[PDB]
Design a protein around this ligand. Structure first.
Ligand code: KIX
Ligand code: ZN
Length: 258
């Protein structure tokens, strides 16, 4: 009886195995755009993905992860609210059964169809597993998806999904350029939070871009054909793999923009 996104094992249950689910810096949150304060001291973000080395795509039973070579400083996030250098390890998405839900963060209570998470770890801690035990261990770039025009840079991801339908399947996924998933503007909100999946560790500096990317209905329909189950098991479509907004508690969301 492992955690998941069903009636019996979904987010409202996670606190039993992971009591930090009720902690003081949980994610995601609602971003109240009127209360977020412009912080003139932040920087422009530095997203340096030219030398990114994608390796593989994995259906882990909760999402699919596009994994990178993080054995050296190839694709890194720096600047913005961050001190030091954060190495890209993987990206994945959260999405809904219909276009009116799917994102984890919300903006004035608006839910987007999906949300992309580019996960990076602080190189001062040497490895990902050490990083997640630190309050400044991870930096996650969050990007909302809305349904409209196709995203050209997403189609290579869409077209491999048939090959990783079920939990535990992987495929080679070399030479994928994550720059093709970014919006034009890097304007962002930032706040201290957590992983949005068990173990829900409070180790993340969240950087949530204001500008959504557009994907087509056909693209997100292919996400929804994935399975949470393993091969041969009763089919459970991989949809609604999002955690709802958690209490903000004693946190301030800062804006990079006026
Ligand atoms: O799956 B997760 O919660 O979704 C948010 C992003 C993140 C970051 C590190 C590990 C897992 C996850
Ligand atoms: Zn995520």
């Amino acid at each position: 009886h492992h955690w998941g996104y069903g009636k019996h094992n979904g987010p409202e249950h996670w606190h039993k195995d992971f009591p930090i689910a009720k902690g003081e810096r949980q994610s995601p949150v609602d971003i109240d755009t009127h209360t977020a304060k412009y912080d003139p001291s932040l920087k422009p973000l530095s997203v340096s993905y030219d030398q990114a080395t994608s390796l593989r795509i994995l259906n882990n039973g909760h999402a699919f992860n596009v994994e990178f070579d993080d054995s050296q400083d190839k694709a890194v996030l720096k600047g913005g609210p961050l001190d030091g250098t954060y190495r890209l390890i993987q990206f994945h998405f959260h999405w809904g059964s219909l276009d009116g839900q799917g994102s984890e963060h919300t903006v004035d209570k608006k839910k987007y169809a999906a949300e992309l998470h580019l996960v990076h770890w602080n190189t001062k801690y040497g490895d990902f597993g050490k990083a997640v035990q630190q309050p400044d261990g991870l930096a996650v770039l969050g990007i909302f998806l809305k349904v409209g025009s196709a995203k050209p840079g997403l189609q290579k991801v869409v077209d491999v999904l048939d090959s990783i339908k079920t939990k535990g399947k992987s495929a080679d996924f070399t030479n994928f350029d994550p720059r093709g998933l970014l919006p034009e503007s890097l304007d962002y909100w930032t706040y201290p939070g957590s992983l949005t999946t068990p173990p829900l560790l409070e180790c993340v500096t969240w950087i949530v871009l204001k500008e959504p990317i557009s994907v087509s209905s056909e693209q997100v329909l292919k996400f929804r054909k994935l399975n949470f189950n393993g091969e041969g098991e009763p089919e459970e479509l991989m949809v609604d793999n999002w955690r709802p907004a958690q209490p903000l508690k004693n946190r301030q969301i800062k804006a990079s923009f006026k």
